[PDB]
Amino acid sequence: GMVEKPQLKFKSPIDNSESHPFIPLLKEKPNALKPLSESLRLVDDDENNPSHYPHPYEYEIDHQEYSPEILQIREEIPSKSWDDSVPIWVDTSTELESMLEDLKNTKEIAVDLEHHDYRSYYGIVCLMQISTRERDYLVDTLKLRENLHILNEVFTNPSIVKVFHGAFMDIIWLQRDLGLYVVGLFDTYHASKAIGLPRHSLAYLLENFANFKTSKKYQLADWRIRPLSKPMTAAARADTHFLLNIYDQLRNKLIESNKLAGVLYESRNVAKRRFEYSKYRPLTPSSEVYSPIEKESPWKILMYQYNIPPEREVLVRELYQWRDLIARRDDESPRFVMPNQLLAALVAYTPTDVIGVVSLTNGVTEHVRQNAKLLANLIRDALRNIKNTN
Ligand SMILES: Nc1ncnc2c1ncn2[C@@H]1O[C@H](COP(=O)(O)O)[C@@H](O)[C@H]1O
Ligand SMILES: [Mn+2]
Ligand SMILES: [Zn+2]
C-alpha cells in the first residue's frame, strides 16, 4: 500500500549533493575500440560547457561498423504467439546470467524501460523489458541495479541490433542508473518519421502493425511495486514483444527508399546523448546533453501567475530553493515535497503560524506539515522585510 522506498535497499547510497559532474558508473568496457583509460578523464571548462566527463562509448558509436544484415532487405519474422510463452521474470544474478548467455546468441533484441520520479529526486529505473525473436524478458532493475552492468557485453556489441522506440530518455536513464550504454541502436521513432507515417508513437505502430490497442493507463502507474500486477506485467511485455517485427518492416521500407543511413545516423546520435547534473549543464541547451528539467512552475516567480503580487517574488524564490534542498535531502521529487499549487497557496495567503500553514484551505503535504514552523518563520520574515525596506 505505502510501498517502501526501494532506494533504502540499494548497495550504493544515492547522492543528490551534486558536488561534481556526473561520473560514469562503468568499470569494465567490452567491445572497446578505445581503452577505458582515455575514457574516464575530464573536459575542462569552456564557454560552451564547463568541466565534465565524456560519453565512454562515443568513439565506438562513431567507428563500430554495423552488422551487414541490417543493410539487407530480409524476410520479416512474425512476433511469437503471445499465448505460446510467459514473460520471463529476472531478479536474480543467476537468472540474469542465463538471460545474458541467451542474448549473446541473437542478431537483434528489442528493449524498453519503465521509470519512476515521484518518490525520488533524479528518478529511478524500475523495470527493463527485453525481447528476442523467441521470448520476452522482464528485468527487475531495482533489485539488480548494481549487477545489470554486465549487459554492456551485448548492449555495446555492434553485431547485435538493439531496437528501441524513442530512446532519447532511455539512453539517459541507462547510464545514470545502470552504467549501461548502447552501440548498434535502431530507433523506430526516427524510422517512422523518415518513412512519413501519419503518427510516430509506439501505440500507433502497435495498433497498425500488430493489432494491439494500448492503454495510457500505466504511464502514470507506480512501477516500484512488487510483485507486478497482471495488467502491468502485460503492458510492459507489450512494449518489446512486437517490436522486432515492426523493426523488420520499417528497416525494409527504409532500405527500399534509401533512407536507412539517415535513420542510423539519427540513432547513433540518440545513443551518444550524455547525462549531466543541471549544475554542470552546458550553457546553450542542446539535444546532445540531458540535464534534469523542472516538471513544474517556471524557476522562481511562475507564469501560472496565481496573481502573484510584486513584492512577493523573494518569498516565492526562497520557497523554491527550500523545496529543492529538502527534495534533494530526503531524495524525493519537488512535487511530493510541495506541489506548486501549494507553494502558490502559501504565497497567496502567507500564513504566519503553524495553524495557518497546516489548515491551508488547499490541504497540505507531509513535508509542509513537518516543517510548518520553519515555513511560518520563512514567510513571516518575508513579510517583515516588505513592511521594512519600503
Ligand atoms: N505520458 C507520460 N507522462 C508521464 N511520464 C511518462 C509518460 N509516458 C511515459 N512516461 C515515463 O516514461 C517511462 C517509459 O515510458 P515509454 O517510453 O512509453 O515506455 C514511463 O514508465 C514513465 O516514467
Ligand atoms: Mn520506453
Ligand atoms: Zn513502456
80 annotated as belonging to a binding site for a ligand: no
H-type helices in the chain, by residue range? Answer: 36-39, 58-63, 93-103, 152-155, 168-178, 188-195, 202-209, 230-241, 243-256, 260-272, 313-329, 334-337, 340-349, 354-358, 366-370, 372-389
Q: Which three cell numbers stand for residue 274?
A: 550524455
CA distance 12 to 246: 38
Q: Which three cell numbers stand for residue 358?
A: 497546516
My answer on whether 168 and 237 are in the same domain is: yes
What resolution in angstroms does the PDB record give? Answer: 2.3
My answer on whether 325 and 289 are in the same domain is: no
Cell 560514469 locates to: 24
My answer on whether 286 and 304 are in the same domain is: no
Write down how long the chain is: 390
330 annotated as belonging to a binding site for a ligand: no
96, 148 contact by CB (below 8 A): yes
My answer on whether 191 and 254 are in the same domain is: yes
What separation in Å is there between the alpha carbon of 271 and the centre of ligand 3?
18
Neighbours of ion ligand 3 (CB under 5 A): 239
205, 188 contact by CB (below 8 A): yes
| Any ligand 1 atom below 6 A from CB of 85 | no
CA distance 181 to 26: 9
What separation in Å is there between the alpha carbon of 224 and the centre of ligand 3?
14
CA distance 305 to 284: 27
3-class DSSP state of 6? helix
3-class DSSP state of 89? strand
210, 246 contact by CB (below 8 A): yes
- Name the residue with the closest Cα to ligand 1, atom 23: 115
Single out the residue in 296, 326, 360 at which a domain terminates: 296
Q: Which ligand 1 atom is nearest residue 165's CA? A: 17
- Name the residue with the closest Cα to ligand 1, atom 8: 219
What separation in Å is there between the alpha carbon of 157 and the centre of ligand 2?
21
My answer on whether 213 and 314 are in the same domain is: no
Measured CA to CA in angstroms, residue 287 lies from 18, 54, 204, 279 at distances of 22, 15, 24, 17
Q: Which three cell numbers stand for residue 250?
A: 520499417
43, 52 contact by CB (below 8 A): yes
My answer on whether 183 and 316 are in the same domain is: no
State the structure-solving technique.
X-ray
| Any ligand 1 atom below 6 A from CB of 276 | no
For the domain that residue 382 is a member of, what is the CATH number?
1.10.150.80
368, 342 contact by CB (below 8 A): yes
Q: 125 forms bridges with which residues in the sheet?
A: 115
Q: Which ligand 1 atom is nearest residue 221's CA? A: 21
Q: How many CA atoms lie within 13 A of 120 on its CB side?
A: 24
* Cβ-based neighbours of 45, under 8 Å, separated by 6 or more: 51
For the domain that residue 186 is a member of, what is the CATH number?
3.30.420.10
Our count of domains for the chain comes to: 2
What separation in Å is there between the alpha carbon of 113 and the centre of ligand 2?
5
My answer on whether 303 and 198 are in the same domain is: no
Q: Please provide the DSSP assignment of 266-289 as one string.
A: HHHHHHH-EE--GGG--SS--SSE
My answer on whether 182 and 325 are in the same domain is: no
Q: Which three cell numbers stand for residue 169?
A: 530518455
My answer on whether 96 and 185 are in the same domain is: yes
DSSP state of 48: S
Single out the residue in 296, 331, 352 at which a domain terminates: 296
340, 295 contact by CB (below 8 A): no
3-class DSSP state of 110? strand
Q: Which three cell numbers stand for residue 346?
A: 502559501
The terminus-to-terminus CA distance of the chain in angstroms comes to 51
- Helices (H) and strands (E) counted in the chain, each on its own, are 16, 8
Q: Hey, how many other C-beta atoms are within 10 angstroms of the C-beta on 6? A: 20
Name the residue of 111, 116, 117, 219 whose CB sits within 8 Å of the most ligand 1 atoms, as the mutation to test its pocket.
219
My answer on whether 73 and 213 are in the same domain is: yes
112 annotated as belonging to a binding site for a ligand: yes
- Per the structure, the complete domain to which residue 56 belongs is given by 1-296
Ligand nearest to the CA of 295: 1
CA distance 294 to 299: 8
What separation in Å is there between the alpha carbon of 317 and the centre of ligand 3?
36
* Cβ-based neighbours of 328, under 8 Å, separated by 6 or more: 16, 17, 18, 121
